[PDB]
């Protein structure tokens, strides 16, 4: 149980290090934000 708890606690440590270092980790959400912002910017630019 001490080993299993320490392995869990350490692996939740690695999640914070990944998310703090690697902004591209969220890339599947940033893709959806970028696609919707690009669709509106295309719609507004088409008024010109």
């Amino acid at each position: 149980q001490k080993l299993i708890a320490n392995q869990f606690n350490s692996a939740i440590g690695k999640i914070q290090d990944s998310l703090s270092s690697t902004a591209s980790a969220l890339g599947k959400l940033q893709d959806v934000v970028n696609q919707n912002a690009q669709a509106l910017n295309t719609l507004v630019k088409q008024l010109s």
Binding site: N41, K45, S48
Partner: protein, 48 residues
């Protein structure tokens, strides 16, 4: 001229409708109008 109130307007034959206000847009001395992403007029220089 009227400011901070919704008005219909015409500058030099450029008609529109909006709240006119003073601005911090640093027009270079040759520039007469400003434009936004749609080519809609964002700002104007007053001819008076």
């Amino acid at each position: 001229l009227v400011k901070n109130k919704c008005v219909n307007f015409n500058f030099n034959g450029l008609t529109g409708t909006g709240v006119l206000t003073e601005s911090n847009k640093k027009f270079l001395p040759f520039q007469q109008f400003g434009r936004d992403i749609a080519d809609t007029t964002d700002a104007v220089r007053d001819p008076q």
